[PDB]
Design a protein around this ligand. Structure first.
Ligand SMILES: Nc1ncnc2c1ncn2[C@@H]1O[C@H](COP(=O)(O)OP(=O)(O)OP(=O)(O)O)[C@@H](O)[C@H]1O
Length: 241
């Protein structure tokens, strides 16, 4: 379980309130999508699960434990994040993917790659997985980088997986390949999906809709879509005109 109890958050002392009174209970094993306008508070919400920031009011709880008194080491074993851009390092591919403990798993890093749809193009490279990449990937293209980051997050094997717009740099096919693998990706873990590409959330158990820091609507894709006055339906309406 993940719990937000009466959460109020602003980044700085004098600064404006970003999250005003958030109450959310992510059940264990739930696949939940978070959508909403740019600047609505989606990634800020997820920042508080990792405790980069602590709220001025209310509490965040993971499986009963209060995060403000939790062990920081323990917390980082719970949460795995495919971040925005999610900067890599100036070394080989295997060490990038194997950041969450290397010297670990011969053919299972490959499994993570296959799941991310990265194993395919990795084959053709000069030293394969031992291919040395740079700061701005001496080799890597945008969507190729991104799939490495998905491979990295999966290798973690976290109880909670934050999928922070992790198909933003991919073609519809690379995305479609990952979505077919989502069932394996999610199997026996809690998955939060931040999406502006609403098709990444079609099959989520629950879509939560954010506006100006508040959870305004919730429901399954079909249910939200069949309410013609919903903000979600209006957003889905706009793509492809
Ligand atoms: N580090 C920060 N310091 C101060 N304010 C911030 C910071 N990060 C974000 N904000 C403010 O928090 C609000 C929401 O930001 P957040 O990134 O959570 O929104 P989002 O829904 O993820 O946006 P996006 O769809 O553009 O990625 C915005 O008004 C933003 O200006």
């Amino acid at each position: 379980d993940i719990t937000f109890r009466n959460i109020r958050f602003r980044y700085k002392p004098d600064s404006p309130v970003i999250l005003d009174n958030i109450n959310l209970s992510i059940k264990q094993g739930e696949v939940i999508g978070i959508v909403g306008r740019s600047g609505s508070g989606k990634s800020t919400l997820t920042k508080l699960i990792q405790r980069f920031y602590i709220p001025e009011n209310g509490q965040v709880l993971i499986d009963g434990h209060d995060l403000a008194l939790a062990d920081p080491n323990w917390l980082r074993r719970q949460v795995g994040v495919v971040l925005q851009d999610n900067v890599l390092l100036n070394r080989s591919i295997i060490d990038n993917i194997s950041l969450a403990n290397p010297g670990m798993s011969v053919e299972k890093v490959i499994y993570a790659a296959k799941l991310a749809g990265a194993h395919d193009f990795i084959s053709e490279l000069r030293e394969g997985y031992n291919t040395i990449v740079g700061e701005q990937g001496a080799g890597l293209s945008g969507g190729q980088r991104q799939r490495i980051a998905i491979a990295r997050a999966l290798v973690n094997n976290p109880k909670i997986l934050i999928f922070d717009q992790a198909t933003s740099a991919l073609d519809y096919e690379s995305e479609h390949v990952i979505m077919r693998n989502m069932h394996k990706i999610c199997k026996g873990r809690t998955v939060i999906i931040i999406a502006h590409r609403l098709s990444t959330v079609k099959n989520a158990d629950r879509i939560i809709v954010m506006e100006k820091g508040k959870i305004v609507e919730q429901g399954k894709h079909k249910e939200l879509l069949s309410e013609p006055e919903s903000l979600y339906s209006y957003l889905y309406q706009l793509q492809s005109d």
